[PDB]
Design a protein around this ligand. Structure first.
Ligand code: KJE
Ligand code: KJE
Lengths: 314, 314
């Protein structure tokens, strides 16, 4: 039948409400002592609507590890913490950086429009924070209680996930987290913002980039000038409020074989943060690379970007 | 392309190795305090190849609950502990009986031929047993440690799942479980055995019943007289060895709108158990009912069978 959004080969949204997910990587079940990596993972409930895949690496000491909270991307509308595309990345990252991984399973558009994802990821972060100083209720993860170092909490995301992390950092700034937990550092791989710049995006890229915000938040107050998509809008929260001490922004130049056009947008964002009076450590990493190579880890450039993100965790 | 097995609408196995399962029930993610039932569930690893959905109901006292280990059926080759068909059943059963649920995610044929499922379910049962007297390593479930009553352990399955439970009971008999854990009671809902009787199965029913054993264990030693499918074969293990004190066998008369033909097979099985010198409590429940009604819970006969299984747990 007719479609509203034909975003082949990623997603089709039909006039009749049907959603075909063309890029849906297979489910990967929980595993103990993964042969390749020694990582173990489990899928745990946070609420009746929010869950997470929790990861622990091969253990040596009693020693506590940084906590790496990941928010997957893909259009606000695709994939899962539980499917191989993002799971394979987080698994390898956990093995390499020796962290407790918490990959959030948040509700996807169009079935659950924004701000569902924002609410879910905030609820999940507060859930992580709620374990501080518990050395237990049925919802509490013993991996986080026993091995999570709340002095080294990181929050990371890609594409719309990085947009969620942005909005979560603003919120962590205004509201604070349970137990006085502070986010030490955050990572945005391929930020997802929409900002008017002096050079217009090309017609095709504008359509295939802005569509995700349009289908995920059709009734957004201010549309693509909503502060949650445009972080320098008239009514936007002060970036000085960002609730982390360290921030890594990683930029790429290609979406598969398509030239990316977010250079100007991300430049305005970074200039705004630097001009804000946020007195944190800013790290930018700008690669001639495909967005996808970070996750697949088949190419040298993919491995370089992986190692750059790994270096941000100490 | 050409197929080896066309079991539309459930599974197609192609000459070129491809496996289509088009009508698999949807995945249902972990949830805390389910609005309908108050049950919570999580997906936890047992090994690098075996996982389980663990269920806990709304909690009142500190009081310990029976442990209900479930082994889903569907052809040795379909569905999942994590998909709605079996999950919805186990969820409702947990709410009604107030038990710790452990629904085993075992490897499916044809990707993992038998005896993979048997090995996986044995490993899962030993994993459950390994929690006895722990009031902990990263693989141990705090729900089982805190709320699991090892004096009231039940092992239950349907269709090929019931075949797995049969073979697991024989094994529990020969090998014993960690910590001296004994299975108190077991349930076979719609047993899956192949036994020669005096009345031949009809052509169509024989094909659509035996196909699951043939595709799951091609060239099993003895074929359909393999002791693991035919529990009264010449070389079959003694049924006196069954490692439970109580057994419920529940029989039905219909597969959807198709007359079932396992009455004679299940009669031979039950007569053999009764003649074995197994000194346990045997319960048989024979309904004029559709196999499917237990899981869907839409009909009065479905609710009757549900309540019969619930009565077996005390
Ligand atoms: C033309 C802009 C564009 C962006 C890229 C980054 C990001 C995304 O959603 O960006 C907004 C995605 N991550 C995925 C991971 C897996 C399947 C799809 C995606 C997308 C959407 C498709 N895409 C096109 C990729
Ligand atoms: C005509 C014989 C026959 C048996 C029935 C019982 C059982 C099964 O595998 O029994 C052998 C199934 N449970 C399912 C649950 C969900 C999808 C399919 C099944 C099957 C296979 C289809 N079928 C055919 C149902």
């Amino acid at each position: 039948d007719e479609t509203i959004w034909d975003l082949s080969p990623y997603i089709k949204i039909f006039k009749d409400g049907r959603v075909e997910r063309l890029h849906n990587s297979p489910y990967v079940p929980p595993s103990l002592n993964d042969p390749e990596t020694g990582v173990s993972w489990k899928d745990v409930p946070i609420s009746s609507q929010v869950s997470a895949r929790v990861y622990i690496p091969k253990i040596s000491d009693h020693e506590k590890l940084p906590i790496f909270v990941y928010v997957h991307g893909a259009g606000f509308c695709l994939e899962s913490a539980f499917r191989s595309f993002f799971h394979t990345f987080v698994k390898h990252f956990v093995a390499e950086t020796k962290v407790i991984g918490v990959s959030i399973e948040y509700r996807l558009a169009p079935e659950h429009l924004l701000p569902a994802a924002y609410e879910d990821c905030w609820e999940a972060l507060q859930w992580v924070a709620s374990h501080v100083g518990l050395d237990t209720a049925i919802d509490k993860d013993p991996w986080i209680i026993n091995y999570g170092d709340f002095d080294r909490l990181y929050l990371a995301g890609d594409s719309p996930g990085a947009n969620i992390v942005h909005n979560t950092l603003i919120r962590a700034g205004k509201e604070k987290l349970k137990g006085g937990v502070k986010i030490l550092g955050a990572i945005l791989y391929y930020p997802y913002f929409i900002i008017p710049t002096s050079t217009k995006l090309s017609d095709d890229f504008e359509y295939n980039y802005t569509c995700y915000w349009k289908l995920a938040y059709p009734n957004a107050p201010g549309g693509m000038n909503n502060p949650m998509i445009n972080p320098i809008a008239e009514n936007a929260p002060d970036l000085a409020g960002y609730g982390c001490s360290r921030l890594l922004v990683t930029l790429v130049s290609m979406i598969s074989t398509t030239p990316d056009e977010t250079k100007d947008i991300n430049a305005v964002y970074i200039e705004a943060l630097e001009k804000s009076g946020w007195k944190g450590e800013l790290e930018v990493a700008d690669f001639d690379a495909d967005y996808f190579e970070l996750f697949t880890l088949e190419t040298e450039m993919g491995k370089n970007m992986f190692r750059r993100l790994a270096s941000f965790i100490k």
